[PDB]
Design a protein around this ligand. Structure first.
Ligand SMILES: CCC1CCC(=C(c2ccc(O)cc2)c2ccc(O)cc2)CC1
Ligand SMILES: CCC1CCC(=C(c2ccc(O)cc2)c2ccc(O)cc2)CC1
Lengths: 9, 241, 232, 10
């Protein structure tokens, strides 16, 4: 997911 | 946790400095008025706001103590609620108006799309009218927005790992303390503190309702291929089926 | 012009609400465990329809409600009816973990909550809310206060606001009577009220579900259809 | 004319 990716940054 | 260590004043300071900026829209008065292009502006605006919201959430005390899957869930659940309380907050000093952006002031007449959309619009206006009459403070608003992030999906969630839900309850209790602390500092009596606290939290029920009705329209929108919904917005929307 | 509700004491407010309480109704005495979509929704529709008649007469006994115009009364009931049904369901399901006591002769679990696309999600939410109320040791006096708040708040967008404040006073009064500290009072108050946001969510999702059942599973009553149509 | 109107009367 995009949301999961942005939360990892 | 660091959140369970913070004083009420440190809690407020933390939330205040984690505040996202107010973004502009691509609104142009010299452009025609396609209420599908209004939704164009709002979709584009919401999508850019989501990026700031995600980085804001990671600076909400206790949020990053949770797993990535739980962080995702809470944001998927609350994103439109959080956008809407932000919208309602910045629209306080504008009776009859919604301030979507500093360059985008819409009332119910420059309108819309209607029966249903005008209803959601009216509900947002009413909520804003409520914040204004309550004289909602900035310190109270950042508490409320943080409560929404943590509460809106605290249920609706594997096994064993359930003390994380306990941790969310602990942080929520702290924000409750912070709210009361703010009201006590404001010189409100005990009865006035309890009443205002209740009034504030009952508003979250209205914000939840507006989000669900708004989500319905966005799903109704999507399937009609009106606005081109962004990739992130599509993924956030599919979370609500 | 002045409402009797505000002139009531806290104990008077409690007694008025306790006395206004609708009865716990029974479902059909057909022994069958409902698994079919038609059978289960058939039983739930029939139950909810009878509950609604009691709810309407309950609402008129909620202090401050009859002081509203008839159209405002209609509006608040159309807005909150499923919320009110659900918190009642959640309340009487407290002492039955993992189950939902729709009626004393109708306990459903998650397994029956399957079989139909769109239930088990809402079913799980109802269970979590029930479990939450149980862990807080929600009292009957608190429950009737919350249910009344839902009736008056959900479709509120000056009189209602003061009545809402009055009920808030009543909740605090109950917790103080229960020997809670001041800190525990505002914390518990906040916890209770935040659950109302989930109840709102469950109602909205449930309402969507009902429109889907409406567009031809089980025949609805005219009353249910009108309450349903009120949510567009 | 809603049923709710009638029931709220009596
Ligand atoms: C009455 C219209 C209602 C529609 C939903 C709202 C939106 C909204 C809310 C808060 C904002 O800061 C920015 C945008 C919205 C619009 C489109 C979209 O793809 C996502 C969110 C609020 C207003
Ligand atoms: C997960 C399924 C969910 C559907 C909605 C619920 C209903 C419900 C809620 C509380 C009750 O005491 C009685 C009935 C319901 C069912 C059918 C109907 O025509 C009206 C209300 C609760 C359960």
């Amino acid at each position: 997911k995009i949301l999961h990716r942005l939360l990892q940054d | 946790s660091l959140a369970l260590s913070l004083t009420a004043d440190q809690m407020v300071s933390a939330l205040l400095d984690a505040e996202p900026p107010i973004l502009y829209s691509e609104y142009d008065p010299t452009r025609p008025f396609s209420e599908a292009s209004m939704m164009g502006l709002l979709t584009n605006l919401a999508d850019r706001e989501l990026v700031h919201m995600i980085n804001w959430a990671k600076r909400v005390p206790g949020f990053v103590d949770l797993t990535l899957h739980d962080q995702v869930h809470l944001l998927e659940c609350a994103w439109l609620e959080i956008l809407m309380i932000g919208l309602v907050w910045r629209s306080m000093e504008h009776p009859g108006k919604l301030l979507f952006a500093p360059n985008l002031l819409l009332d119910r007449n420059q309108g819309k799309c209607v029966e249903g959309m005008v209803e959601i619009f009216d509900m947002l206006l009413a909520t804003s009218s409520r914040f204004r009459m309550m004289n909602l403070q900035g310190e109270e608003f950042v508490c409320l927005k943080s409560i929404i992030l943590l509460n809106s999906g605290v249920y609706t969630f594997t096994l064993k790992s359930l003390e994380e839900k306990d941790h969310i309850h602990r942080v929520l209790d702290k924000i409750t303390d912070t709210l009361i602390h703010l009201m006590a500092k404001a010189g409100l009596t005990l009865q006035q503190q309890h009443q205002r606290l209740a009034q504030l939290l009952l508003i979250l029920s209205h914000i939840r309702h507006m989000s669900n009705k708004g989500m319905e329209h966005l799903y109704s929108m999507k399937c009609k291929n009106v606005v081109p919904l962004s990739d992130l917005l599509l993924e956030m929307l599919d979370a609500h089926r």
